[PDB]
Structure 1
Amino acid sequence: AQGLAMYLQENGIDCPKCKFSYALARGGCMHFHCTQCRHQFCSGCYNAFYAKNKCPEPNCRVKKSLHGHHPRDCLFYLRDWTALRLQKLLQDNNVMFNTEPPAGARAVPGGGCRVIEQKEVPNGLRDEACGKETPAGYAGLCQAHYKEYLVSLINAHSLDPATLYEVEELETATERYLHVRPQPLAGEDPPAYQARLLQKLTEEVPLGQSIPRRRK
């Protein structure tokens, strides 16, 4: 309904540590640093970023690096999906989404994608439309911003991307969150194996616990 408008308007972002409220400026990476308390966190899932060798989890194989522990529904993972696959997750769950711009839209000067970014320019920053190519069916947004829009809807409705995982993806997610490399049990056929992995992942690894959700 108003999902696209809500993505396009200026959003807030709150420091998960000190609760300070900001206006989100798009255009940067996923590493956010609170200017008030210096807490570093992911813009997608609000989990903490740990610098090299200060992460708490044994054994985080990415321990020797700057990293966070992102849930499977963080944009960190979902930005790699095709728009078609993100659309399928929404469609499978009866969630409407835009493929065309608002009926009463407004021409973007130069562009291109209409999303306003704070861009780096010689000697500072400048607010400017994204301007990237806008494929048909991407609601007037570029590929990356269209995917962010779809992810905003996926997260709002607490949709689980694992429902669409292939067996290899279930195995990878299993290794990541449950720290064990799964394998078929003796007597277990490939479909039963996939079903077991999906079942175990769903009941043992929650979706992002700090991703804001529709509360109704």
Structure 2
Amino acid sequence: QGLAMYLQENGIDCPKCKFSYALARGGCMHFHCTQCRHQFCSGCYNAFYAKNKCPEPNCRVKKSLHGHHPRDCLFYLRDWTALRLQKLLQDNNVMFNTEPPGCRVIEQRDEACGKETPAGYAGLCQAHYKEYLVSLINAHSLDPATLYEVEELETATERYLHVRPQPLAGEDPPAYQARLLQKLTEEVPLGQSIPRRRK
């Protein structure tokens, strides 16, 4: 099937029981293991913790079912435009397909995706093509923060460093942007349990 089997060949391995599913993620991040009933993010393998069961030291949503994702998890990068994901890859000289080397990715009755496969998406649908691009991004450990606007750096600083940044008096936007980026890059690492394929 081309890239459909590339997505399906390296599927989803339960962090708890290590059972291997040969499935694509598309845009669905909530995965529930049949064998051990573990619930985890298929993009970063972090667990979804139930109410009052989150070890995250500064979690503010402790009393509800939720999960925490690194900034390069498909949970976030699925919402980028394909163009922005491609820019991140091109800036790092990473080859990506726009043409094949309905969507034929096989999902669960076990049936095919079958959604529209627009031109430039290598014979896949919007969601699976973005998953393909994000798998290249993850395989090369590329940092999406390098394409953030100031507003995304502010949100990231809050989410991952728990401080609300503010521009300094007389600090032009370029400097503010570079200060937030420099800080986030130094302190917050990329996903530590993201399943990164070979490059």
What is the TM-score with the length of structure 2 in the denominator?
A: 0.89
C-alpha deviations, 1:52-108, integer Å up to 9, x for none?
Answer: 332123532333332111000101000000011111011110011111112xxxxxx
Cα distance in structure 2, aligned partners of 1:56 and 1:181: 22
Cα distance in structure 2, aligned partners of 1:71 and 1:39: 19
Cα distance in structure 2, aligned partners of 1:151 and 1:74: 8
Cα distance in structure 2, aligned partners of 1:153 and 1:24: 17
Higher RCO (CA 8 Å, separation ≥ 6 residues): 2
CA positional deviation for 1:165: 0.1
When residues 18 and 94 of structure 1 are mapped into structure 2, their CA distance, relative to the original with a 3 A threshold, is same
Identify which range, 92-101 or 48-57, moves more after superposition. 48-57
When residues 175 and 40 of structure 1 are mapped into structure 2, their CA distance, relative to the original with a 3 A threshold, is same
Identify which range, 15-24 or 165-174, moves more after superposition. 15-24
Cα distance in structure 2, aligned partners of 1:214 and 1:25: 14
Q: How large is the RMSD of aligned CA atoms in angstroms?
A: 2.4
Aligned length: 199
Cα distance in structure 1, aligned partners of 2:105 and 2:24: 11
In the alignment, is the contact (CA less than 8 A) between 1:49 and 1:68 conserved in 2?
yes
What is the TM-score with the length of structure 1 in the denominator?
A: 0.83
Q: Flag structure 1 segments of 5+ consecutive residues without an equivalent.
A: 103-111, 119-125
CA positional deviation for 1:210: 0.6
When residues 9 and 30 of structure 1 are mapped into structure 2, their CA distance, relative to the original with a 3 A threshold, is closer
Cα distance in structure 1, aligned partners of 2:8 and 2:197: 18
* Percent identity (aligned): 100
Cα distance in structure 1, aligned partners of 2:2 and 2:187: 30
- Runs (4+) of structure 1 exceeding 6 A deviation are none
**Which structure features the higher share of strand residues?**
1
In the alignment, is the contact (CA less than 8 A) between 2:13 and 2:21 conserved in 1?
yes
In the alignment, is the contact (CA less than 8 A) between 2:72 and 2:138 conserved in 1?
yes
CA positional deviation for 1:156: 0.6
C-alpha deviations, 1:9-33, integer Å up to 9, x for none?
Answer: 4334222223343433657932222
Identify which range, 127-136 or 139-148, moves more after superposition. 127-136
Q: Flag structure 2 segments of 5+ consecutive residues without an equivalent.
A: none
Kindly name which structure, 1 or 2, has the bigger radius of gyration based on alpha carbons.
1
SS state at 1:41 partner: strand
